[PDB]
Every structure is written in structure tokens, then in C-alpha cells.
């Protein structure tokens, strides 16, 4: 793109907080885990995706990341280390600091009430300066941070603070599982990145990565935000023109949000502009699932397709990333290919179909009869065999032109006939 002549000088030097280290030396399947090598960097700390991992396969490598956070609550970190039976003798600095925060707080908490009480701007803005200073120090006063950014988000340096603060809030309130407060930053961060301060390529790209995470936890059916992320900026597989960015799930969850909520007539716009472009060419070399999902599909394979599609669904059910719609993908991954395979077909067996997807032929029959009920194919079952038949040759296209080509001219000659 036109920004990418600029991105090509900077060569992937993004403003990460954790400095490239992760839960390293992993055992199990990698394109699932590799997302915590781009998130847990561009998206700062991503600690719910540490707690998720142990439940499928035990680690003690979540522990070094679990030492190093304070805005969730300081002492929750101070326990997980003790639980791993670690001497960590010199924890004398967070008890020093986070205590003396209560002494500092009794000023701002007093000033805060008295100002919003009076309705007096000056006493509220000097508070907002004292209080936007403070609410990055500890987040356990969650109601105080919530009350702070409620009335005024315009602080003494406006957009600079507001961005790192609404981002620090969108980050911390997902870690509190305060999804309603994170849904407040869903409104406010997406405007703050669009009304941009400087548009420097080091931050412009990172701000477009931050557009993922408010859609991602699925407490209140947020994936409808597919319709937002296609309108807010132009279409891209990754919203970063630096190809060194890689999210697998952004396209899997886009594929879920297209099919499971809207009509399949809407999916070949994606198959062009999001499944073939220059970023996605690098992506097609790498991810197994999302490759099988579309490359096998668009080639109109059926044999390797509906087998390796059915194989993806073993790796899908291994997902402990929080979503509501993991199974409506498993549903539609069988539906969508079947319609397209049978589209030009002669005669498919319900029995061959049922051997493949590991269902009984009765299920496959009522499934096919429901695909025909839904009128996604015009077909008819050879009931004796348990085979299903499409057979439109549709000869004689001549008549399609013949009515209108005269009905046009007979009513359009009326124009020149008038005067």
C-alpha cells in the first residue's frame, strides 16, 4: 500500500512492552500457540491466555510472566509464585509503594467528590490531572478508574494520555473480566485511533492491532464487529501492512462471523480480497486449518476437502480461547463445502457422504433434505439407492433475450414517435 513505502524504512520495530520473551519451549501444536507471540507483544500483557494453557497441558513457564503485573491486583501475582514453592524473600517494594498510594489517594478521592459536587471545572481538571496521574499506579481501585474516565476523557495533554489510558483501560478491564467497561472502551479507543495524534508507522500499525481485542473475548456476542472492522478501515487480512504481523484467528473468526450470522452469497468477496492478497500469500504458506478451509474449497476438491475439513474440527475443539461460536463453525465447515460440491454434480451417495464425515446415512439424508429445504441446491433424492441427484443441463437460452429485445424497442421507439 501507499503507507507501505513508509513502513519499508522502519522494518518491524514495534513498541512492545514484554520484549520478545514468551512461554517458550512448548510441547503441543504450534499455530494455536503462535498468537501469544504477537499478542503478548503488540497488545502488551495478555495474562488470561497464560491461565488458559495449564488446563490442557501443564506448565510452570506461566510463572515468570505471573511475577510482573500490578494493575490486575498486586497480590494475585504474589500468590501464584508462592504456590509454585518459590522463595521470593525481598517483596518489600510493592508493600511500600502500593501502601503509600492509599496515602496519596485520600487527597484525590477527597478533591474528586468536592469538584463533581460543585460542578466546578477547575477543581475537576486539577483533580483529572492528579487522578489521570494516579490510575496507572494500581487498578484494584477499579470503581475509581471507572468514575475518572466517565465525566471527562479530555486531560491536560488530550489524545496522547487518552490513547495510552483508554488502551491501558481496555487492557486491564478485559483482565478484570469487566466486559461492560471494556465495551465502553470499544466505543472510545476506536475513535481515538481514527482521530490520530501523529500517524507514525511504529504506532499506526500497533493501533490497528488494538482493534482486534475488543471483539475477542465473546461475553456478549461481539463478533458482529466484523461489519465494523470492514467499514472503519479498508479490507485487509491483517490490518497491518507490515507482513511480520500474523494473527491466524482474525480470519477464522471473520469466516465464523460471515457464515454463521449472514448468507453465504456474502463469502466470495472474502475469497478474493482477503484470501489471495499480498499479506495472505505469506499466510497461505503457514496455517494448516484456514488453508484447508478455503484452498481445498475454491479448488472444488471434495475428497481431500471434506476429509481435511473434517480433520480441522479436531483442532477446533482443542480451542480454549473464549468464543461462543466454536461449534457453528464445525457445523458450517460441512454445510458450505457440500452445497458447492453438489452445485454442478450428477449423483452423490448419502452413504459415501456418511462414511466420510462419520455420521449415519439417515442423519446425512435428513441433512441433505434440509439443505434442499433451505433451497441452497435444487436436487432430488434417488431414495432406492440413497443417492442424491442434481441434473440441470438447462438447454435453449435463446428465449431470454427475445421478449425484452423487442419490448425495449417497442416502448423506446415511443420516445422519438412523440413529437
Amino acid at each position: 500500500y501507499d503507507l507501505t513505502t513508509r513502513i519499508a524504512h522502519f522494518l518491524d520495530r514495534h513498541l512492545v512492552f514484554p520484549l520478545l520473551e514468551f512461554l517458550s519451549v512448548k510441547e503441543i501444536y504450534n499455530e494455536k500457540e503462535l498468537l501469544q507471540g504477537k499478542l503478548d507483544l503488540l497488545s502488551d500483557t495478555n495474562m488470561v491466555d497464560f491461565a488458559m494453557d495449564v488446563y490442557k497441558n501443564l506448565y510452570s513457564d506461566d510463572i515468570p510472566h505471573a511475577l510482573r503485573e500490578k494493575r490486575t491486583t498486586v497480590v494475585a501475582q504474589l500468590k501464584q509464585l508462592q504456590a509454585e514453592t518459590e522463595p521470593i524473600v525481598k517483596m518489600f517494594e510493592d508493600p511500600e509503594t502500593t501502601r503509600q498510594m492509599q496515602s496519596t489517594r485520600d487527597g484525590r478521592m477527597l478533591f474528586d467528590y468536592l469538584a463533581d459536587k460543585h460542578g466546578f471545572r477547575q477543581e475537576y481538571l486539577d483533580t483529572l490531572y492528579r487522578y489521570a496521574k494516579f490510575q496507572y499506579e494500581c487498578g484494584n481501585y477499579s470503581g475509581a478508574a471507572e468514575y475518572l474516565y466517565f465525566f471527562r476523557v479530555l486531560v491536560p495533554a488530550t489524545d496522547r494520555n487518552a490513547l495510552s489510558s483508554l488502551w491501558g483501560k481496555l487492557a486491564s478491564e478485559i483482565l478484570m473480566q469487566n466486559w461492560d467497561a471494556a465495551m465502553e472502551d470499544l466505543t472510545r479507543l476506536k475513535e481515538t485511533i481514527d482521530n490520530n495524534s501523529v500517524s507514525s508507522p511504529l504506532q499506526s500499525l500497533q493501533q490497528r492491532t488494538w482493534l482486534i481485542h475488543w471483539s475477542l473475548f465473546v461475553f456478549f456476542n461481539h463478533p458482529k464487529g466484523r461489519d465494523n472492522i470492514i467499514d472503519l478501515f479498508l479490507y485487509q487480512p491483517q490490518y497491518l501492512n507490515a507482513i511480520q504481523t500474523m494473527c491466524p484467528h482474525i480470519l477464522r473468526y471473520l469466516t465464523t462471523a460471515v457464515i454463521t450470522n449472514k448468507d453465504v452469497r456474502k463469502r466470495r468477496q472474502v475469497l478474493k480480497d482477503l484470501v489471495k492478497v499480498i499479506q495472505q500469500e505469506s499466510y497461505t504458506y503457514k496455517d494448516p486449518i484456514t488453508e484447508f478451509v478455503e484452498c481445498l474449497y475454491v479448488n472444488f476438491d471434495f475428497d481431500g476437502a471434506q476429509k481435511k475439513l473434517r480433520e480441522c474440527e479436531s483442532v477446533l475443539v482443542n480451542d480454549f480461547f473464549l468464543v461462543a461460536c466454536l461449534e457453528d463453525f464445525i457445523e458450517n465447515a460441512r454445510l458450505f463445502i457440500f452445497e458447492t460440491f453438489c452445485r454442478i454434480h450428477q449423483c452423490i451417495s448419502i452413504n459415501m457422504l456418511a462414511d466420510k464425515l462419520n455420521m449415519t446415512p439417515e442423519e446425512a439424508e435428513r441433512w441433505i433434505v434440509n439443505l434442499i429445504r433451505n433451497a441452497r441446491l435444487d436436487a432430488k433424492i434417488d431414495s432406492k439407492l440413497g443417492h442424491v441427484v442434481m441434473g440441470n443441463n438447462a438447454v435453449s437460452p435463446y428465449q431470454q433475450v427475445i421478449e425484452k429485445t423487442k419490448s425495449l424497442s417497442f416502448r423506446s421507439q415511443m420516445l422519438a414517435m412523440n413529437i
Binding site: 439424508e365 433424492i381 434417488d382 431414495s383 427475445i402 421478449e403 423487442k406 414517435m417
Partner: protein, 372 residues
């Protein structure tokens, strides 16, 4: 006040002329003979008849839909205004057809199908396209009211075609040219929802600009949404009855919405269960004679899984789109699958296309007349 200065001056001028129309048509042949001679157009004498069809219906619909009690409008017009003009010895020329179509237009505001055949018997004089299109207009609406969907859909197709071998210039169907477009569009859209397995014959009847939108309407209606029950019924009502003017919309007078309770809620009962007949036919008959695999595959579609079963299937088969056998020892369901034919449009076009040649060869031989 300017409202009812115009309205009252129409009716009082029509009640004046109603005496002249009874006086001329019956007996005074020298007065009719004197009226044949003087002008260059007898069209001025003819147009005033069916000009007052739609204008008087407007003025009487206002008075009807303002006075809902102690009825002055409907018995005055029904007794004097209509039957005096039409019942008696008719005018000695085509003018007798024009008052017949005017009376048919008045008869059709009473929701009925009986006298259409007795009116057709009295349409002795030849069916000129000007009279014939307006006959098929209300005769098709009578077949629509008669539940002859298979008949009425054929009758709406011809009158919407707009290749009917007339130039139709000089205001003969004025102020309402697109009412003939949109009413035939609308009333045909209701019929297709019932019987879409016979009509391959759709393509000449409605144009692809409208077939695309009305096509998806029928599917969206019967299958998955009762939304189209609303928007179809919104457009269908002003066209099914033809109430020429709705009165001034204000809350200070009531007076108007009270007759619209009955007029609307009468058509509610029509589209109600006639639409719910459609969804049964919507799932196409995939296998023509159904064994246990397909009968049970369709009982699942008939309605919900319950301790009472087959009886609703046995009910739904009694309507005009199913004919069947049940064999008890086999336990078998045998059924009719039915269609028409694709290759009929062309041989109806073979004359219509020759009219595009004819009128082409003719009109430029009227220009070849002038500039020569």
C-alpha cells in the same frame, strides 16, 4: 371549505347530467342524431361517462368515509345514481359499453363475484381493447376473489404486457397510467405465492426489474419470515379495493378510519390462511412416490415431533395442490407431482414482434407522408 366547494359541485353537475343521460339514450333519436353531426370528435361525448366513473367514485367515497351513520351516500347512489343510468334502454352506439364498465367499477366496491357473468352477457357490443383491458381488470379480480388463482394469474399477465396493438394516445386512461402498472403487478404477486409449481409461464407477465424483488418476496414470505405478510398486505390493500381518495388525515375528525377497519380487516381473512397453504407446497416434492425414507423425511417437515402424528399431514393433503394414495398393507404414500411447460412465450410473441415491425413500417410511412 375549498375542499367541499369542489366536491359538491361535481355531484350536483352529475345529478344534473344523469337526467340528460336518461333523456337522450331512451327515446329522442333526433337529439342523438343532432349530436352525431356537429363536432369533429364524438370522443368528447364518450369520455364524460367514464370520466365520471372515477371522479364520482372519489366524491362518493369521501362522503361515505366521512358519514358513517344515518347513511345518505350509499343508498342514494346505489338506487338513483347507478341503476337509472345503466339498467334502462341503452344509447344507440358504443356509449352503452362505457356506462356498463362505469357500473362494473361501482359494483366492484362491493366485494362480490356474482353479477360479473350477467354484466358480461350484456357486453353484447364488440370488445375493443379500451373496453377489454378494463373488463379483464375486474374479471381477473373476480377470479382472484373466486380462489381461481390458476385462472386469474393468466388474466393479469395480458393486461400488464403493454403490446396490446393500440397507440392509446389522447388521454383515454389518464392520471392513472401507472395504476394499471402497479395494481396488476401487486394483485399478480398474491396469486404466485399459492400456486408456484404450475407457472413456468411467468416471464412475459412481469418484467425482470420486478420479478427479482417479487420473486424473493414469495420465498421470504412463505419460508422464513412473516415480515412479507406485512409489507405485501400494506401495498395490496389500496389496490385490492381501489379506494380512490383517502380523506384528509387528521385526528380532530375521526370519521374515516372507522370504514377502514372493515375494508382492511375483510382482506385480512383472505391472505391469512391462503398464505399458510403456501409453505406446505414450498418444500418441492423431491421424490414423487415416497417410501418410509421420504414420508418420515416429510413428516419431520409437516410440523413438530409429538405423540399425535400423521393427522396434520392427512389434513394438509386435502387442499387443491395435493392428490394421493395411502396403501395400508405397504404403509406407503403415493402422490401427484405436477408442472406446465417452458416453450409457449415464443408463439405468442410471433405476432407481437410483427407488430413491432408493423407499427415501425407504418409510423415511418406517416413521416414519409409528411416530409414528402
Amino acid at each position: 371549505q375549498w375542499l367541499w366547494d369542489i366536491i359538491d359541485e361535481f355531484i350536483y353537475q352529475f345529478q344534473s347530467f344523469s337526467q340528460y343521460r336518461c333523456k337522450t339514450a331512451k327515446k329522442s333519436e333526433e337529439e342523438i342524431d343532432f349530436l352525431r353531426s356537429n363536432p369533429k370528435i364524438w370522443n368528447v361525448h364518450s369520455v364524460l361517462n367514464v370520466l365520471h366513473s372515477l371522479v364520482d367514485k372519489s366524491n362518493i367515497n369521501r362522503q361515505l368515509e366521512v358519514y358513517t351513520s344515518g347513511g345518505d351516500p350509499e343508498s342514494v347512489a346505489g338506487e338513483y345514481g347507478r341503476h337509472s343510468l345503466y339498467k334502462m334502454l341503452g344509447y344507440f352506439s358504443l356509449v352503452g359499453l362505457l356506462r356498463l364498465h362505469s357500473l362494473l367499477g361501482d359494483y366492484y366496491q362491493a366485494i362480490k363475484v356474482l353479477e360479473n357473468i350477467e354484466l358480461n352477457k350484456k357486453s353484447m357490443y364488440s370488445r375493443v381493447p379500451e373496453c377489454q383491458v378494463t373488463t379483464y381488470y375486474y374479471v381477473g379480480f373476480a377470479y382472484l376473489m373466486m380462489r381461481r388463482y390458476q385462472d386469474a394469474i393468466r388474466v393479469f399477465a395480458n393486461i400488464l404486457l403493454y403490446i396490446q396493438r393500440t397507440k392509446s394516445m389522447f388521454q383515454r386512461t389518464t392520471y392513472k397510467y401507472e395504476m394499471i402498472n402497479k395494481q396488476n403487478e401487486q394483485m399478480h404477486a398474491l396469486l404466485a405465492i399459492a400456486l408456484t409449481m404450475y407457472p413456468m409461464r411467468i416471464d412475459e407477465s412481469i418484467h425482470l426489474q420486478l420479478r427479482e424483488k417479487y420473486g424473493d418476496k414469495m420465498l421470504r414470505m412463505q419460508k422464513g419470515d412473516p415480515q412479507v405478510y406485512e409489507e405485501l398486505f400494506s401495498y395490496s390493500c389500496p389496490k385490492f379495493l381501489s379506494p380512490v381518495v383517502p380523506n384528509y388525515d387528521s385526528v380532530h375528525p375521526n370519521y374515516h378510519k372507522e370504514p377502514f377497519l372493515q375494508q382492511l380487516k375483510v382482506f385480512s381473512d383472505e391472505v391469512q390462511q391462503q398464505a399458510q397453504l403456501s409453505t406446505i407446497r414450498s418444500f418441492l416434492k423431491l421424490y414423487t412416490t415416497m417410501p418410509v425414507a421420504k414420508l418420515a423425511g416429510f413428516l419431520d417437515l409437516t410440523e413438530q415431533e409429538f405423540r399425535i402424528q400423521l393427522l396434520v399431514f392427512k389434513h394438509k393433503m386435502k387442499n387443491l395442490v395435493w392428490t394421493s394414495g395411502i396403501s395400508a398393507l405397504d404403509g406407503e404414500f403415493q402422490s401427484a407431482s405436477e408442472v406446465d411447460f417452458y416453450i409457449d412465450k415464443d408463439m405468442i410473441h410471433i405476432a407481437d414482434t410483427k407488430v413491432a415491425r408493423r407499427y415501425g413500417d407504418f409510423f415511418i410511412r406517416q413521416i414519409h407522408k409528411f416530409e414528402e
